């Protein structure tokens, strides 16, 4: 299967940041991962390009409209590869 998906799944319960089409970045917990890259978060920070930053409780994001997703450095070599 696709390894990035697997990696994402593995990192369920990590402080994952985000960046969308518009550039509305985020940084909260990873709640769940799927084959299509649909994500849900907790205690999520909203830091948009507009400037008006806010603090939100939960948020769910569409996978298709993602540019990329941030991950910590722990799952780098192991255990996902071999």
């Amino acid at each position: 299967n696709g390894i990035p998906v697997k990696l994402l799944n593995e990192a369920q319960g990590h402080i994952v940041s985000l960046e969308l089409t518009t550039g509305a970045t985020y940084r909260g917990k990873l709640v769940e991962s799927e084959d299509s890259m649909n994500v849900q978060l907790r205690d999520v920070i909203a830091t948009e390009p507009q400037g008006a930053v806010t603090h939100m409780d939960q948020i769910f994001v569409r996978g298709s409209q993602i540019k990329f997703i941030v991950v910590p450095d722990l799952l780098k070599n192991a255990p996902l590869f071999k």
Binding site: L7, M37, F68, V71, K76
Partner: protein
């Protein structure tokens, strides 16, 4: 830049690649995981901005990329 006649994506895995997106925001990062969509996980992210001249910098993450809005991938400087 020092990069040879590399035939395919699997033969150039784990290289420090420039990556390009739809809006124009340029990247740099070490290639980790090939994919169907080219959702290429980078070892470290440093995205760069140009206003609508001159290039800026960021450093937030070490990212799982998503392929939809990518343009193409270019080698910068190999490891080891």
């Amino acid at each position: 830049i020092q990069v040879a006649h590399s035939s395919r994506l699997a033969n150039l895995i784990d290289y420090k690649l420039r990556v390009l997106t739809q809006d124009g925001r340029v990247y740099i990062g070490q290639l980790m995981a090939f994919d169907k969509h080219m959702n290429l996980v980078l070892n470290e992210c440093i995205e760069e901005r140009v206003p609508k001249i001159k290039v800026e910098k960021r450093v937030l993450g070490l990212t799982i990329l998503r392929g939809e809005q990518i343009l193409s991938t270019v080698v910068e400087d190999k490891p080891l």
